[PDB]
């Protein structure tokens, strides 16, 4: 136990004790990144894998050689805050020391001629922070892990609808990391056509004759040989026992002297057993028996003649007579069957286009690259660089591991190049899987879908960048002049950085990570998508990738997935499933030894799970490890059935195995439908916090780890005692056990203030700990934007009543009270960005001044002489935030405005009112004004004062940091001085500046004092170094886009309340819109008098099957009753020792609580703070499938002075009369969404049209109206409305000379329909006229 648990003890309802705790919730991101970036030369993984698969390289004919030895990634030149506000990619230069040696011409092996061992910068790979985020171009991006096709072999079975009358096709493909797709697709005639990279079909013998094997070799290497004999010109057969099995008797099958079978006899197992027992030596066969069994030998005339019969020749009676005339007695024929070993390769060999090796190889060149007639060497080189080249094919012993595990092999290590026996192995497995023997995998199996994480896909992108720079260096190195050719200029930084910046920020995997909640960050980092290159698309997918498999138990969660078009493509990772060394997903399990389970951790992959039995953690478990109920249900081989005790070997470790981290936060999933849980977790990802993060009342137990594992909170790297806590920083004093001699014993946490996220909301690391309390290792110091005391504060908790009130909760809508905004409970900070950009056109550069025409002085009253608002200016929607006018060209005026300029003194000069104003409806203040400028441009007084404010911040904060660090170091020095000796006058009364030179007698404590003195000298050096870095970072020339004078950024921060129209949802998918902010006098209330805050719709319960929200509501009412009992016993201030019995009675009501915590071992002050935190409700945890049954919830209601029925007889607010039915009322803990009404309400009226088709735009930031789509056109025409449709497509949006006439008609009051020629129908007319088609009107 720790100290942060004692405040708000989270009581759990876990009936099974957990063995393994919550692992790191940034597994597939951060562990893959540290596998990618660290110095691991022995493992050949990450950056080292690509660096050893590309390098070493050489020149032509042995003249030069470029080697890779001593790479080192440099220091990152920026930190997270300046690259967030500036828009620069958070990266470090990768200075790899490339060693270019030159071969000696006369020597057979060139050792040393010119050692070019120069450090060469090769690309800027992005750096992942401790949170697990990539700050690319200012936006905090997270690249999702790709659910691609696993490398190696994959056998697929069709679902019909390709060939009628049955005859299903078991096709098989070969998947590399990159290159070609070796496919083996069958035919209705069963010819197994080989397809390469989705081209046309080709016979299989085309690729089999290119390995220099002849036709008899490939015939013998696929099937057994049935040796027929001709004994003294009589037909016999030396029969092997493996051939004649499970067939019919075409002739009288007998022995050499004993009759065993007749003609037309069904050969059962009895005939086979009698033959194998008595005699199988020589069986005589008729002449028509071999006619049908095709010969597999190239039998020629033995004396001098040529091939009388080749391989795969259709034998006949005269052909058998010719074979008896010339040949040998031993005849090796192809074994022909229908269900064991069919003659399918003979059917490939009946239709082969070419037979020779050359023509064959060429037969390929035409299928791969058609139209070009190749030579021998060109086709050979294309075959080598398409199938057997390391530059175009790589598996790296993981795809080879899948290739060996799926083809019944045993080797784990294999080279990335496919072997000549690998094609033989996959074709033998193809014949076996077409003959029925063996099992076939499917697309939905998780052993066939691997995790392409951030590190692996970044390794692949750096690999293809290495192929591009290899194509550069192969033509750069072989052109001489190798004396002035040090390898810096030879390795161009353009394609590598272009690739690693096109993948980071512009690929389909890279997207905007929603930083509104820590839950959204950790469910977007643990998000397994299947888009981009390699994976599927949202429009080209079926039901197989979306519907889950029984192998998805614990690895890929079926809940957290978006409700859009790609409903199953973007999956997510569970809490306990991590990535493997190969890359597959593993679920940890506890080993069972014949009914005896242990508490160790055994991870199990998806393929190795298919031959085992998996028991769930919901079974009855005792305290030493057995099965209580003697009969449990388990999973086996992808199914589910009942099992015994001793047959089980693997046991699940915890009850939250199958759910995501965004889904484990959902309480009462055992009482929840899977329909509402998916979109409920989706909008819990889209949930947005409030001003004050209230305590989460109903919990799950995952809340105590998601904050510490998210990284947005102040994490305890070293534990100790709180020394000084500010609103922007926390200084904790590290204790002696976690103290390092090379440090100062002080870990200051620079808390991030109100910065902008990627969803226009606030991020504020509020300090939550008090002054003077111990915080141990791994605990919380400052809660983030949506956390509270290390617990995930997604929203707020309040009274919710499942009852109808005047039809306001009609179709699952929210009816709020006044107290959600009167107490400011649901108000929300929203930090946006509005970069007033001053680009430089031809008609003068854009100045930022204050004198703006055509505006009043009250609009410019909150501006300085530079036009920028002061810090803290409460601006309103419509005012000007930055006065940024442009010098416009002298546009030709209308003569009426020329007369107006001649009459009055209105002289509109080249200054133009183009200042970016506040968008209308958005109120709020300003929190920061970031100003950036180009080099060579002077600064005004506002940019100078903002640079001075930033310099004063970086001076004063670092000076206070150095002051408290000096205080902690001198406190350590004083502790050493009082540990060695004691001097109350010489040490304490003397000032602290003369403490480095003062020393005691020579001891190890004196050596530690000298170590702290030289550490303080290094601190004085690095403070000057950091001040120089801040001087060269703050007022440096900000590298922006060219042709820009200066870019100023503002941050509007609005206290966005819960307006009518906002989106608000609970924890069970019960979403809704704010119908009306109802006054609290109209809201219903209980007999105690507490007015309810939320009026929820009970109509959406039985259709959507979410009864778990009612269980959550009853448990929340019980927890709130306990909280009101605690608040009633606290405001009287009677005693403390009754609370130590009452809350302890409230912590044990189930069958067996997972934590048997006692309040007798706590202090008076800790119990007082625990009760003070328990005043705002009771933190109560419930597992997702080990939750509380309604009996314990009824006991919780009985302990909180509440009826057992759960529904309290309520009193109405509008009429005052009590209802005839008791009303279910309690706590739902609903959350504020990201689909707020100021982000949803967006209209448009004649502003900022387009240029292509003269169309209104779309989007609120672009200020464009909603699309009147074609279905709305068909419905409006189904009404028969002609005049509205003639406006909605011709004179409201289309005709530029029509909408202006309509506007002038409506302004002058004439509401007359004036149609005309549409200005986008003539767009189509001139488009098809330019296309080459004549068209005109009548």
């Amino acid at each position: 136990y720790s100290y942060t648990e004692k405040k708000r003890i989270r009581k759990d309802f876990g009936k099974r004790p957990q063995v393994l705790d919550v692992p790191y919730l940034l597994s597939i991101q951060l562990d893959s990144f540290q596998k990618f970036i660290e110095q691991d030369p022995e493992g050949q993984y990450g950056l080292e894998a690509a660096f050893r698969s590309v390098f070493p390289i050489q020149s032509y004919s042995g003249n030069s050689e470029l080697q890779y030895v001593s790479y080192r990634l440099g220091e990152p030149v920026f930190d997270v805050q300046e690259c967030q506000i500036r828009g620069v990619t958070y990266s470090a230069p990768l200075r790899v020391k490339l060693r270019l040696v030159i071969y000696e011409r006369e020597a057979p092996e060139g050792t040393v001629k010119d050692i070019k061992e120069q450090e060469v910068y090769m690309g800027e790979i992005p750096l992942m922070t401790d949170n697990g985020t990539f700050v690319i171009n200012g936006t905090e991006r997270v690249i999702v892990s790709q659910l691609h096709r696993s490398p190696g072999v994959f056998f697929d079975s069709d679902k019909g609808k390709t060939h009628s009358s049955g005859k299903v096709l078991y096709n098989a493909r070969i998947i590399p990391y990159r290159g070609s797709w070796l496919d083996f697709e069958f035919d209705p005639k069963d010819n197994l056509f080989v397809r390469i990279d989705r081209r046309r079909k080709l016979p299989a013998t085309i690729i089999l004759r290119a390995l220099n094997y002849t036709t008899e070799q490939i015939l013998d290497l696929f099937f057994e040989k049935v040796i027929f004999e001709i004994r003294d010109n009589k037909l016999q057969m030396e029969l092997v026992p493996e051939r004649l099995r499970g067939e019919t008797a075409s002739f009288d099958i007998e022995a050499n002297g004993k009759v065993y079978v007749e003609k037309g006899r069904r050969i059962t197992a009895r005939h086979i057993r009698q033959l194998e027992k008595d005699d199988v030596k020589l069986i005589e066969v008729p002449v028509e028996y071999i006619a049908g069994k095709v010969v597999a030998k190239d039998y020629i005339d033995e004396s001098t003649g040529e091939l009388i019969c080749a391989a795969n020749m259709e034998l006949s009676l005269d052909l058998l007579a010719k074979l008896s005339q010339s040949g040998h007695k031993r005849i090796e024929t192809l074994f022909t069957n229908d269900l064991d070993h069919g003659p399918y390769i003979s059917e490939t060999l009946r239709v082969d286009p070419t037979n020779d090796r050359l023509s064959a190889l060429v037969e390929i060149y035409r299928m791969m690259r058609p139209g070009e007639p190749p030579t021998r060497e060109a086709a050979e080189s294309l075959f080598e660089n398409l199938f057997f080249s390391e530059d175009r094919y790589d598996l790296s012993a993981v795809g080879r591991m899948k290739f060996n595990r799926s083809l019944l092999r045993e080797e784990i290590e294999g080279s990335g190049i496919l072997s000549k026996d690998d094609i033989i192995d996959v074709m033998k497995k193809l014949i076996d899987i077409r003959n029925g023997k063996g099992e076939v995998d499917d697309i939905d199996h998780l052993g066939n879908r691997r995790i392409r994480s951030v590190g692996e896909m970044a390794e692949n992108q750096f690999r293809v960048g290495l192929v591009r720079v290899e194509r550069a260096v192969k033509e750069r190195l072989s052109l001489g002049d190798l004396d002035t050719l040090m390898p810096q200029d030879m390795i161009n930084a353009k394609p590598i950085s272009a690739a690693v910046k096109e993948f980071f920020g512009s690929s389909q995997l890279s997207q905007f990570m929603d930083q509104n909640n820590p839950l959204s960050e950790i469910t977007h980092k643990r998000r397994i998508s299947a888009l981009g290159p390699g994976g599927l698309t949202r429009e080209r997918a079926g039901f197989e990738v979306r519907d889950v498999h029984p192998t998805h138990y614990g690895r890929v969660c079926p809940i957290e997935t978006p409700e859009g078009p790609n409903i199953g493509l973007i999956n997510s990772l569970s809490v306990y499933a991590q990535t493997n060394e190969y890359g597959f997903l593993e679920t940890p399990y506890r080993k069972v030894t014949d009914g005896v389970v242990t508490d160790e951790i055994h991870y199990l992959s998806a393929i190795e799970e298919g031959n085992y039995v998996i028991a769930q953690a919901n079974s009855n478990l005792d305290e030493e490890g057995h099965f209580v109920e003697d009969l449990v249900t388990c999973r086996s081989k992808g199914e589910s059935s009942l099992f015994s005790r001793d047959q089980v070997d693997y046991m699940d470790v915890s009850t939250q195995q199958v759910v995501s981290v965004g889904a484990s936060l959902i309480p009462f999933l055992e009482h929840d439908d899977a329909n509402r849980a998916l979109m409920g977790a989706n909008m819990q990802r889209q949930a947005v916090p409030t001003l004050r993060a209230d305590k989460p009342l109903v919990g799950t137990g995952m809340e105590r780890a998601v904050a510490v594992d998210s990284g947005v909170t102040a994490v305890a790297k070293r534990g100790g005692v709180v020394q000084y806590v500010d609103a922007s920083r926390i200084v904790i004093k590290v204790n002696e056990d976690e103290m390092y001699p090379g440090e100062a014993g002080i870990d200051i946490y620079n808390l991030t203030k109100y910065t902008r996220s990627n969803q226009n909301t606030c991020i504020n690391q509020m300090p939550c700990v008090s002054l003077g309390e111990p915080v141990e290792r791994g605990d919380v110091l400052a809660d983030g934007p949506s956390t509270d005391l290390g617990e995930l504060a997604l929203g707020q908790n309040m009274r919710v009543a499942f009852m109808p009130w005047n039809g306001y909760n009609f179709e699952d809508s929210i009816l709020v009270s006044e107290r959600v905004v009167q107490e400011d409970r649901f108000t929300t900070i929203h930090i946006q960005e509005l970069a007033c950009v001053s680009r430089d056109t031809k008609l003068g550069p854009e100045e930022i001044t204050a004198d703006i025409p055509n505006v009043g002085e009250a609009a410019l009253s909150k501006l300085d002489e530079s036009g920028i608002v002061y810090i803290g200016a409460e601006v309103t929607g419509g005012d000007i935030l930055v006065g940024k006018v442009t010098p416009k060209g002298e546009t030709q005026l209308t003569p009426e405005e020329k007369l107006l300029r001649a009459i009055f003194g209105e002289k509109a000069s080249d200054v133009k009112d183009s200042s970016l104003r506040v968008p209308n409806g958005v109120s709020g203040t300003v929190i920061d004004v970031q100003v950036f400028t180009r080099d060579g441009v002077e600064k005004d007084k506002r940019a100078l004062e903002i640079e001075e404010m930033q310099l004063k911040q970086a001076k004063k904060d670092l000076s206070e940091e150095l002051q408290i660090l000096e205080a902690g170091l001198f406190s350590r020095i004083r502790a050493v001085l009082v540990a060695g000796g004691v001097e109350a006058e010489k040490l304490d009364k003397l000032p602290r500046d003369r403490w480095l030179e003062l020393g005691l007698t020579d001891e190890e404590k004196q050596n530690q004092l000298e170590q702290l003195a030289e550490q303080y000298d290094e601190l004085k050096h690095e403070f000057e170094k950091k001040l120089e870095a801040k001087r060269r970072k703050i007022t440096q020339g900000d590298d922006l886009a060219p042709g820009v004078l200066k870019i100023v950024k503002v941050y509007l921060a609005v206290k966005r309340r819960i307006q009518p129209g906002d989106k608000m949802a609970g924890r069970h998918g019960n979403k809704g819109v704010i119908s009306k902010i109802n006054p609290i006098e109209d809201m219903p209330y209980d007999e105690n008098g507490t007015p309810v805050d939320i009026v929820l719709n009970p109509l959406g319960v039985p259709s959507r099957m979410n009864i778990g929200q009612i269980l959550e509501t009853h448990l929340g009412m019980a927890a709130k009753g306990i909280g009101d009992k605690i608040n009633a016993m606290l405001k009287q201030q009677q005693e403390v020792a009754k609370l130590r019995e009452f809350i302890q009675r409230a912590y044990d009501l189930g069958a067996d609580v997972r934590q048997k915590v006692d309040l007798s071992t706590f202090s008076d002050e800790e119990v007082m703070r625990l009760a003070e935190n328990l005043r705002k409700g009771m933190p109560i945890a419930t597992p997702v499938f080990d939750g509380a049954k309604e009996a314990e919830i009824k006991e919780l209601l009985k302990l909180g002075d509440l009826p057992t029925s759960g529904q309290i007889r309520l009193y109405d607010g509008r009429t005052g009369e009590q209802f005839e039915r008791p009303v279910t009322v309690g706590y739902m803990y609903m959350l504020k969404l990201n689909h707020l009404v100021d982000d949803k309400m967006h209209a448009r009226s004649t502003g900022s049209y387009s240029l292509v088709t003269q169309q209104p735009l779309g989007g609120k930031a672009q200020f464009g109206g909603q699309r009147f789509g074609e279905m709305e056109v068909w419905a409006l025409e189904a009404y028969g409305a002609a005049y509205t449709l003639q406006e909605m497509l011709t004179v409201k949006s289309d005709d530029v000379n029509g909408r202006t006439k309509m506007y002038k008609n409506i302004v002058d009051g004439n509401h007359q329909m004036e149609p005309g020629m549409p200005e986008s129908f003539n767009v189509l007319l001139k488009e098809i006229r330019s296309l080459g088609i004549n068209i005109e009107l009548e």
Partner: protein, 49 residues
């Protein structure tokens, strides 16, 4: 066929239960910005602007 159009306001749906069957709600801000030619014509025809 399916084109963007002016005077089209994207907004969420809320519950008005105190209205008739032919009556709906409308925000005063969205009706203020949405009905701008009607607002200007009614302000010029009344003499208030």
């Amino acid at each position: 066929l399916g084109k963007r159009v002016d005077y089209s306001g994207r907004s969420v749906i809320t519950v008005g239960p105190y209205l008739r069957l032919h009556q709906c709600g409308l925000p005063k801000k969205m009706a203020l910005e949405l009905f701008k030619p009607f607002i200007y014509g009614k302000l010029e025809l009344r003499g208030l602007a």
